[PDB]
Amino acid sequence: AEEFPVPNGFESAYREVDGVKLHYVKGGQGPLVMLVHGFGQTWYEWHQLMPELAKRFTVIAPDLPGLGQSEPPKTGYSGEQVAVYLHKLARQFSPDRPFDLVAHDIGIWNTYPMVVKNQADIARLVYMQAPIPDARIYRFPAFTAQGESLVWHFSFFAADDRLAETLIAGKERFFLEHFIKSHASNTEVFSERLLDLYARSYAKPHSLNASFEYYRALNESVRQNAELAKTRLQMPTMTLAGGGHGGMGTFQLEQMKAYAEDVEGHVLPGCGHWLPEECAAPMNRLVIDFLSRGRH
Amino acid sequence: AEEFPVPNGFESAYREVDGVKLHYVKGGQGPLVMLVHGFGQTWYEWHQLMPELAKRFTVIAPDLPGLGQSEPPKTGYSGEQVAVYLHKLARQFSPDRPFDLVAHDIGIWNTYPMVVKNQADIARLVYMQAPIPDARIYRFPAFTAQGESLVWHFSFFAADDRLAETLIAGKERFFLEHFIKSHASNTEVFSERLLDLYARSYAKPHSLNASFEYYRALNESVRQNAELAKTRLQMPTMTLAGGGHGGMGTFQLEQMKAYAEDVEGHVLPGCGHWLPEECAAPMNRLVIDFLSRGRH
Numbered sequence: 001a002e003e004f005p006v007p008n009g010f011e012s013a014y015r016e017v018d019g020v021k022l023h024y025v026k027g028g029q030g031p032l033v034m035l036v037h038g039f040g041q042t043w044y045e046w047h048q049l050m051p052e053l054a055k056r057f058t059v060i061a062p063d064l065p066g067l068g069q070s071e072p073p074k075t076g077y078s079g080e081q082v083a084v085y086l087h088k089l090a091r092q093f094s095p096d097r098p099f100d101l102v103a104h105d106i107g108i109w110n111t112y113p114m115v116v117k118n119q120a121d122i123a124r125l126v127y128m129q130a131p132i133p134d135a136r137i138y139r140f141p142a143f144t145a146q147g148e149s150l151v152w153h154f155s156f157f158a159a160d161d162r163l164a165e166t167l168i169a170g171k172e173r174f175f176l177e178h179f180i181k182s183h184a185s186n187t188e189v190f191s192e193r194l195l196d197l198y199a200r201s202y203a204k205p206h207s208l209n210a211s212f213e214y215y216r217a218l219n220e221s222v223r224q225n226a227e228l229a230k231t232r233l234q235m236p237t238m239t240l241a242g243g244g245h246g247g248m249g250t251f252q253l254e255q256m257k258a259y260a261e262d263v264e265g266h267v268l269p270g271c272g273h274w275l276p277e278e279c280a281a282p283m284n285r286l287v288i289d290f291l292s293r294g295r296h
Numbered sequence: 297a298e299e300f301p302v303p304n305g306f307e308s309a310y311r312e313v314d315g316v317k318l319h320y321v322k323g324g325q326g327p328l329v330m331l332v333h334g335f336g337q338t339w340y341e342w343h344q345l346m347p348e349l350a351k352r353f354t355v356i357a358p359d360l361p362g363l364g365q366s367e368p369p370k371t372g373y374s375g376e377q378v379a380v381y382l383h384k385l386a387r388q389f390s391p392d393r394p395f396d397l398v399a400h401d402i403g404i405w406n407t408y409p410m411v412v413k414n415q416a417d418i419a420r421l422v423y424m425q426a427p428i429p430d431a432r433i434y435r436f437p438a439f440t441a442q443g444e445s446l447v448w449h450f451s452f453f454a455a456d457d458r459l460a461e462t463l464i465a466g467k468e469r470f471f472l473e474h475f476i477k478s479h480a481s482n483t484e485v486f487s488e489r490l491l492d493l494y495a496r497s498y499a500k501p502h503s504l505n506a507s508f509e510y511y512r513a514l515n516e517s518v519r520q521n522a523e524l525a526k527t528r529l530q531m532p533t534m535t536l537a538g539g540g541h542g543g544m545g546t547f548q549l550e551q552m553k554a555y556a557e558d559v560e561g562h563v564l565p566g567c568g569h570w571l572p573e574e575c576a577a578p579m580n581r582l583v584i585d586f587l588s589r590g591r592h
Contacts, residue, residue: 141438142448143451151439155439156448167463175463
């Protein structure tokens with residue numbers, strides 16, 4: 001079965017990578033573009049972009065290990081460990097040319113190490129709506145004069161005693177609706193049907209755990225990145241961020257300037273954290289145009 | 297019915313204050329000292345210190361509105377609103393003389409306004425383990441490199457949609473053990489027996505809700521205090537903080553210096569948030585010695 005509907009002309013398939021069975025949805029023809037989702041979601045967050053992109057590229061959208069229909073990692077959830085699976089998966093499909101990478105939220109955490117360590121393999125890079133794990137994350141406020149802050153959830157999810165799984169189990173749909181809407185500007189785009197689909201997926205016990213294990217490895221990822229970052233990114237890079245409630249604003253581009261020589265950034269007014277859903281048309285356009293400046 | 301065992305010689309009683317029935321435990325003779333507990337607990341946190349103080353003072357330890365065996369407030373949960381109830385309670389027992397005040401955690405939030413608005417009513421003051429609500433709280437980090445963020449729970453508890461009650465209902469005993477121990481240095485003092493007592497109390501639906509309403513009013517309390525703090529505290533004040541895991545460290549004294557003309561501070565090594573239980577002997581000594589500088 002499928003947790004989410006596959007777009008016309010795409011296929012849902014699996015590949016074993018280092019003994020881990022990864023799920024992905026693939027379509028199109030041309031150079032490879034890998035699209036990597038984040039927390040609370042699956043490959044399906046890219047389902048509106050995929051058909052448009054597939055007109056010019058071969059498009060693959062994996063489920064992160066442990067999430068969607070992918071098996072948990074057998075190594076661990078730190079950025080460097082997860083990035084190995086994503087890198088090898090991409091290379092199975094693009095062994096002879098560099099590929100493009102688009103990542104959202106923790107998709108960034110799970111890809112940055114393989115980008116920096118395999119620069120020749122990455123033609124163009126698009127990063128949206130999450131910090132690269134580094135010392136900057138220790139500066140975000142716990143609480144704001146308006147109420148709950150953007151990343152207090154880092155601590156909630158990283159807490160031990162399986163705090164998050166224990167409190168959220170049985171209330172998965174309730175929690176996810178709250179989390180999504182609290183990080184959104186445009187809540188209307190999240191139908192009760194769409195929320196049902198996402199909630200059922202991440203409520204799988206191994207997926208609920210996997211979700212938070214990414215956060216439990218965050219400090220480790222920060223320490224890993226402290227070494228990796230000595231090497232600057234040289235490929236064309238674009239950042240995108242929402243300017244509305246839930247958005248990273250100018251943070252995304254400003255951080256990326258420290259990592260990349262060649263970067264352009266956009267802040268999208270009226271949009272929060274969930275760019276592919278909240279501001280699908282302009283996000284899609286920017287991504288497509290940016291990637292289409294390379295051979296396709 | 298008593299939620300916690302009354303120390304020998306003390307009485308458990310109630311006083312109606314502005315239409316709200318407040319529970320307290322009272323004992324001893326002499327000048328009045330009021331002890332005010334914080335989140336996750338009740339008057340019982342003071343039960344080891346009370347008999348010692350009662351040798352020199354009349355001691356009263358109320359349950360905060362909505363917590364323990366006290367009815368919720370009829371006005372609101374902001375510091376200025378709650379402090380009215382506590383000031384009036386204390387003044388019932390000490391109508392013609394100033395009294396001493398010791399407060400822990402949100403006990404600070406709920407007493408600071410009555411202290412500043414009624415300075416002549418307060419002889420001596422001891423505050424421990426929480427910021428006075430002001431702009432400084434917006435500076436605490438959501439996520440830390442080492443240990444754990446001290447105040448990310450502010451956002452969790454303040455979040456709308458009754459997020460915290462909804463997730464914690466039915467799992468109160470689990471949550472409180474996690475919260476208390478994660479904020480502790482000497483975790484061994486929190487026996488399953490003691491945790492059972494505390495959890496049973498805050499698991500009352502109105503008490504679980506009351507607990508979080510204090511945090512939902514926190515920004516309002518900050519706004520209140522911005523005006524109130526234009527007048528500095530004139531009475532002798534002492535701050536205590538833990539130096540261990542979960543401790544506020546030097547922050548407690550440093551913030552207090554902005555508020556008080558006459559302040560001395562102590563940081564207790566190897567002690568976390570829960571001073572009266574984690575570090576009973578040196579905490580009790582510091583408090584009794586400080587209050588005994590006055591006539592008793």
